[PDB]
Every structure is written in C-alpha cells, then in structure tokens.
From TrEMBL, chain B:
Heme c binds at H46, K72, S84, C134, C137, H138, F148, Y152. The keyword Iron applies. This is Cytochrome P460. The keyword Metal-binding applies. The chain holds residues 35 to 194 of 196 of the full protein. Keywords: Heme, Iron, Metal-binding.
Length: 159, 160
C-alpha cells in the first residue's frame, strides 16, 4: 500500500503520521558551524514509509511510490549529563521526496522534491530540478538518496 | 490488548531486542568523541526508540506504562562535512543500551526501571546494572519518570 496521498496535479498532500514510519538516520548541521545560517537548520531526522521499507529489505531498491520525509529540528542545547555535543530542541519543519515513474517521468530518477511553508500547510510545493534534485543527483550514494548517512538502510538491505 | 515487546529470561533479564529499528523513533542526539576528551561516554550518535505499544499508551496518557521498553542505539560519527554544510553525520553502528519499566519484575529498583547493557549485537541477553551505574544520573536529571524527554521532541509533541 502506497503512503503518499495526492491532489489532482500529483502534488503531495502534507504527510501525516510520518513519525510512525521507519526512521533511517539523523544528522545535524548547526547554525553556528554554517555562518549562523544553515541551509537546513539544524537536526535532520529522516523517515521512509513502511511499504517502501519492506521492499527495500528485499531488494535494496526504492520502489515506485517511495516517500521519504526529512524533519528539521533546532539545536536545543550543547551540553547535557551525557557530555558535550548537540541535543535537539523544537521542531522546525519538513522536506520530502517521492519516487513515481508515472507521475514524474522526466525528473531525475523519477523523484519529485517538495518543500512545506509550515506545519499547517495542507500540501507541499513541488520544486524545480535545479533547487533540489541537482545536488542529490550529484552527491547521493544511491538513486538520489544520501544513503551514506542512513545506516538503517545500509544494514537492512540484503547481503 | 496490546502486544508485549521484548522477551525475558526466568531471572527477568531482557533478551537482546530484535526489530527495535521498526519501533517508534523518539529523538537523536550526538556526543562526539572530539568534544569529550577524545572519549565520549556514549560514542557518538544516539538514536532512541520506544516500543509501539508503550507509544500508543503515551499518546493517550503522557506516562510510561508497565512494560515500556526504550532502546538507545549508538553509532559513530562518519563525517563532519557534506553538501548540506558543516556538522556531524552518522557512520557505523556501535551498540545499544536499554531500559525496561515493570513494577512486577523490578519492584525494588528506582522507578521500577531496569537498565541493561549489551556486550555485543551477538549476545543472547543484556546485563542488568546497579542503581549507581545508570539510574542515578537518570533520576537526578531526566525531565520525566527518569527518561530524558527534554531531548525527545517526538515524545513531547505526542502527549495530550
Ligand atoms: C537530505 C534530504 C532528504 C532526506 C533523503 C536524503 O536523500 O538524504 C530529503 C528528502 C531532502 N533533503 Fe536535500 N539533502 C542534502 C544532503 C547532503 C542530505 C543528507 C545529509 C543531511 O541531512 O544534512 C539531504 C543535500 C542537498 C543540497 C546540496 C547543496 C540541496 C540544494 C538540497 N539537498 C536540497 C533539497 C531540497 C530542495 C528544497 C529538498 C526538498 C530536499 N533537499 C529534501
Ligand atoms: C540516554 C539514555 C537512554 C534513552 C532514554 C533516556 O532516558 O534518554 C537510555 C535507554 C540510556 N541512556 Fe543514559 N542518558 C543520559 C542522557 C543525558 C541521555 C540523553 C541525551 C543523550 O542521548 O546523550 C541518555 C545520561 C546518563 C548518565 C549521566 C552521567 C548516566 C550514568 C547514564 N545515562 C547511564 C546509563 C546506563 C548505564 C550503563 C544505561 C544502560 C543508560 N544510561 C541507558
């Protein structure tokens, strides 16, 4: 079963319940290491929909209909009883990408990339290939997903 | 009824959990070695999960039921720079820690939490820990019921 609901123009409605999908990894780009203004502030927690996770464990490929959500959160502090580093604060927003060879036949890898103005928006804004796919195409380890940073995906694909 | 996540020996020791990566992620933090005298206490990234039944209960109540299992997975820092900017990015898996709340199995431990260490992903079961080794820091400093919910935005957003 596909996990992305759409409008008529194949625009992605804001995903709901993605926090109960399969988490695949977290990174952090703090503002203070990026001239006080990270591109994606700051923590990033990333999820893949459960059906696509199932298909990934079998094939090590992203099926048609894969949805991946990147959730941004703030750095809430830099020191805790466990030591120094970065610790998350409040949610900041989300980004998403959807793979569909039928609805997006001419985008790189048949991926559409979406931004969201706020948590209350009812739908995403599809982006031009220049804005997001170009960087993913140029540097992602596998099929435009930065799986070099998702150890859940790497450990979970078939041997 | 809800499912029972985690299995236990007759001495009530948690068997090494399987499938916890399909549980509910509640937040990640990072204590890099280079920021902690080249040896962090829990190196380095920590990805945290709560079992799906306790997550269902937490959504309704905001408390940790009896039978709550939380798993903290450790991973190394893989790199400090990527096309998205400077920071910290995960590498390989290092190991796990876990805590289990059960007033029937652990009537005398603080909070009725049992803290477990694991010697490897290959171990059959965990090693339960003395109160000073784990529960002490957790009871003094965690925001809620010995769980550090100040670092679990999923938990804080999901409670009623
Ligand atoms: C993370 C991201 C994800 C998660 C899946 C993945 O491929 O990692 C999504 C759905 C997304 N972004 Fe992309 N992005 C970049 C890198 C290195 C990572 C992982 C490391 C981290 O989390 O910091 C990403 C790289 C880039 C980038 C390089 C200059 C650009 C311009 C973009 N990303 C742009 C976008 C988007 C355009 C608005 C967009 C919707 C993204 N990313 C979504
Ligand atoms: C994270 C942890 C978790 C996840 C649930 C939680 O309460 O956060 C578990 C299951 C666990 N550790 Fe504990 N721990 C500490 C802090 C600040 C955090 C969250 C921020 C982060 O990820 O860095 C924890 C603090 C401490 C601490 C203070 C010095 C000590 C002594 C311990 N933790 C000890 C233990 C354990 C004994 C070996 C053990 C099995 C833990 N923690 C498990």
């Amino acid at each position: 079963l596909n996990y992305g609901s759409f409008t008529k123009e194949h625009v992605l409605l804001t995903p709901k319940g993605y926090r109960e999908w399969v988490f695949i990894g977290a990174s952090v780009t703090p503002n203070e290491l990026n001239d006080d203004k990270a591109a994606f502030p700051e923590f990033h927690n990333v999820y893949i929909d459960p059906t696509s996770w199932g298909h990934w464990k079998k094939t090590g490929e992203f099926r048609d209909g894969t949805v991946i959500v990147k959730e941004l959160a703030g750095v809430g502090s830099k020191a805790s009883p466990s030591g120094n580093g970065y610790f998350p604060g409040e949610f900041n927003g989300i980004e998403a990408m959807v793979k569909d060879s039928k609805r997006y036949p001419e985008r790189p890898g048949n991926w559409a990339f979406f931004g969201f103005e706020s948590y209350e928006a009812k739908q995403g804004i599809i982006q031009t290939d220049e804005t997001c796919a170009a960087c993913h195409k140029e540097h992602a380890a596998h099929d435009m997903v930065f799986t070099q940073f998702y150890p859940v995906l790497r450990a979970g694909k078939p041997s």
